[PDB]
């Protein structure tokens, strides 16, 4: 039993990480088949990153200007192209460690595993969630650009995120594997700010449903509430207002536990107003908000990932 924030095994993703160097700027790249995906600002110098013209900067570079080091072997770049905010480096050798993969775009609230890399080598793996402000509260240092977020669905490796930059508040922004940023952020060092950091409410309710499945139910009550009354209370505590679809997302968890969503909403409303008061839920005093209802089913099933 028990529930905890879990990331996917990163073995298949480690075999796809390479190092891409352009001039005096280096970062991580994703090697799938004969294409290497890396953030487009690798062609930027230290001074270009303020307000770069990437169309102008890309014409300055040729194929031999890109140094791609796969482990201890340099890959020969035979082609290059820019798709939105990512660079596509075509190499002469296909990656033999390429797993079954797909390029997907995740949504705010959903979770994925991040493999933090530096110099094309993996350094750590953690599970995070796309925050409501389209950022992620990760741990990234200099050179971590190109690190990918991913999920493992059966046989397929679903690449859904790729790191680019860090925002002034310490949160991080990135794009999908097609170069489209998550949120209103641009890959340049001009004035930018993320939205208000709020708590993913639907994931907190899933965390509470997992506690009931695990056996923790001291927070339940006989009371029910309306969607409007809970949202008026949740908004005062910087919680995201619950939408009708987010109620239907918790359907399977509501049917398994026999506790309606609006019933569990009265429990979370009491936990916010009265407070935790020195008691823990699932062995923790803080309410986890990066645990989707799909993560509850994954850890109930014991399925291999």
């Amino acid at each position: 039993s028990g529930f905890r924030k879990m990331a996917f095994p990163s073995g298949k993703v480690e075999g796809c990480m390479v190092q891409v160097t352009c001039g005096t700027t280096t970062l991580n790249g994703l090697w799938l088949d004969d294409v290497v995906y890396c953030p487009r600002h690798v062609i930027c110098t230290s001074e270009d990153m303020l307000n770069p013209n990437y169309e102008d900067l890309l014409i300055r570079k040729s194929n031999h200007n890109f140094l791609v080091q796969a482990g201890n072997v340099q890959l020969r770049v035979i082609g290059h192209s820019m798709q939105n905010c990512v660079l596509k480096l075509k190499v002469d050798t296909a990656n033999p460690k390429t797993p079954k993969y797909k390029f997907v775009r995740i949504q705010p609230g959903q979770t994925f595993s991040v493999l933090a890399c530096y110099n094309g080598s993996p350094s750590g793996v953690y599970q995070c969630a796309m925050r409501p402000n389209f950022t992620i509260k990760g741990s990234f240092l200099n050179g971590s650009a190109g690190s990918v977020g991913f999920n493992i669905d059966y046989d397929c490796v679903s690449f859904c995120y790729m790191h680019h930059m860090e925002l002034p508040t310490g949160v991080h922004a990135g794009t999908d594997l097609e170069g489209n940023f998550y949120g209103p952020f641009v890959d340049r060092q001009t004035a930018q700010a993320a939205g208000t950091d709020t708590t993913i409410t639907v994931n907190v309710l899933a965390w509470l449903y997992a506690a009931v499945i695990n056996g923790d139910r001291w927070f339940l009550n006989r009371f029910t509430t309306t969607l409007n009354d809970f949202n008026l209370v949740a908004m005062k505590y910087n919680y995201e207002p619950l939408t009708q679809d987010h109620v239907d997302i918790l359907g399977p968890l509501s049917a398994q536990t026999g506790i309606a969503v609006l019933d569990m909403c009265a429990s979370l409303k009491e936990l916010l107003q009265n407070g935790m008061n020195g008691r823990t839920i699932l062995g923790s005093a803080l309410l986890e908000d990066e645990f989707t209802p799909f993560d509850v089913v994954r850890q109930c099933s014991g399925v291999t990932f």
Binding site: T25, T26, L27, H41, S46, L141, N142, M165, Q189, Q192
Partner: peptide
């Protein structure tokens, strides 16, 4: 402070 792109200087 200000937003920064999280590449690194080549060594």
């Amino acid at each position: 402070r200000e937003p920064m792109l999280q590449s690194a200087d080549a060594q």
